[PDB]
Amino acid sequence: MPKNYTLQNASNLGWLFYKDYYRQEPNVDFISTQGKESDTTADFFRKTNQRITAYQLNSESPLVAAFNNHFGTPLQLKTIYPGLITGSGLPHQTGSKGEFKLGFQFDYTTGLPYIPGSSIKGTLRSMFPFSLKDKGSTKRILPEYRKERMEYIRDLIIEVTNINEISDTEIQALEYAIFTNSTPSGKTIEFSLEEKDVFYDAFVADSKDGVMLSDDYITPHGENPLKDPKPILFLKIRPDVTINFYFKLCTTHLYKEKVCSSKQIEEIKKQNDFSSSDYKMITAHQKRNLFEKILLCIGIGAKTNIGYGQLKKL
């Protein structure tokens, strides 16, 4: 109920948004057709919304400090005015008045709004050329998809690394090593324990002088310009909220358009055939900067084509 979301006194935001949202209070009707647009239902949902959108997150929160301890140094980014929407496809719609129509991604235990690591991984892989599966339904669009994403990823790799020129096959190998951790044919590479790219969850870390959740309106004006539009209400992460992106990245060694482990490159370097031109490496910091530039270019979440989920460097 108060501000300053803490483990001591704060309702679970996911619980409040999913289970306590639709509590069966006496004299509230959202099952019948008449009750859904009744004003009592609107007031009930409005009070629940007010409770949801009234919490703050201190920069020195013990929760985020524990996250930093467990998952390493964060990548701190902030949100631009439209906001950040994630998990919009989760079902949270009854057709009642004053209710949040779209779903929202909350952590089960903590309740803090978060971006699951799968969302981050998929958003990063989408800009990589070999994300679309060659399955037959995508035969037509695969070539142009691969070409444009290959060009963009080549620009980003050249900009962020010290590699002067990288090939399409090397781009394929790098993408498969980073995400699938294998060769493009599915063959496993003999990687060590710490040579794996882990995309942790992204957590809200700091809402400086305001709440971290807010309500926004999307109003689709109909095809008919004479009928009234239908407003849509949903929950967004507020502008100027610090999102912490946690990664566990490694160093990728490329030799002759192939991805090799640390030991394989250690043995290959000693051999009296080691071509320096045919050797490329991307450190963890360079990979993190590549991911950071991808995020700053395309953003993360839902409704991204209309400006939502756009991130800025802190």
Partner: protein, 279 residues
């Protein structure tokens, strides 16, 4: 000999799957113990995860875990890994973000296991846990209950309106028991805990396979909530002293995080192993 109890604190969500042998409303369901029907980590998975962590040290893995597959000199393992059973689970509330939930049957199971296996610090823990269980049973008098030991947590909702918390003032919770079981501890009857940990109440995470921004597959995954605690037993089994010392020191170091389960690349199932502290 020298059996010890280790506690698994899940830093993130856990998915240890049972395969497609189970069909529920959720596509992917987690492993459950065949007796108590509670979420558990099989001893094989635990041994595999710890072996994967220690793989760099070849002598330690060979002496302790045994020969790797496809090794000419097959060699048995010296240490014995026991199944990881659920100790405490986080439950969502309105007074607090989450509470650590344990059941009276889980406590009885823990007491029985400590009595049978003779853990290192089992004596005082057995004494105080038996005392706590007896006090809990005396207060309940054969009824459903939800007992909290912090007076500010009165009237709290435990994941559901029908499960409301009460505080019996004169039942004490020892600081060491609080450390082992978790802060904001609520002790539930068997019915309440079986309702909270059943397939319908365990958290579900959704995943979507996208093809050029269009949905291809949509499946939902059952996960064990983060910060959940599990316990397992380790038997030395006449192993070399220095290798065991290194193993214990590495496993119990706060900097050590172990990955157990599926979806490692997206951050599922990172845990910390801790030893049973002296009471």
């Amino acid at each position: 000999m020298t059996t010890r109890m280790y506690v698994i604190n899940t830093l993130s969500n856990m998915h240890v799957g049972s395969g497609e042998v189970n069909y529920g409303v959720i596509d992917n369901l987690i492993q459950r113990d065949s007796v108590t029907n509670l979420p558990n980590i099989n001893s094989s998975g635990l041994k595999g995860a710890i072996r994967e962590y220690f793989k760099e040290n070849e002598d330690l893995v060979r002496e302790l875990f045994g020969s790797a597959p496809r090794d000419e000199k097959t060699l048995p393992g010296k240490v014995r890994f026991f199944e990881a059973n659920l100790l405490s689970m986080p439950v969502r509330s309105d007074k607090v973000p989450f509470l650590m939930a344990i059941s009276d049957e889980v406590l009885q199971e823990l007491i029985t296991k400590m009595k049978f296996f003779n853990c290192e610090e089992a004596t005082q823990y057995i004494s105080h846990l038996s005392t706590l269980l007896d006090n809990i049973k005396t207060q309940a008098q054969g009824t459903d209950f939800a007992y909290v030991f912090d007076p500010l947590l009165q009237g709290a909702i435990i994941e559901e309106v029908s499960i409301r918390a009460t505080c019996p003032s004169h039942i004490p919770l020892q600081p060491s028991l609080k450390k082992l079981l978790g802060d904001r501890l609520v002790i539930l009857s068997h019915k309440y805990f079986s309702i909270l940990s059943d397939d319908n109440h365990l958290p579900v995470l959704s995943r979507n396979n996208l093809e050029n921004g269009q949905s291809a597959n949509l499946w939902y995954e059952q996960v064990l909530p983060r910060y959940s605690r599990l316990y397992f037993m380790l038997m030395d089994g006449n192993a070399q002293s220095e290798y065991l010392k290194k193993f214990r020191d590495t496993l119990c170091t706060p900097s050590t995080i172990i990955q157990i389960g599926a979806n490692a690349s997206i951050g599922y199932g990172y845990c910390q192993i801790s030893e049973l502290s002296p009471f």
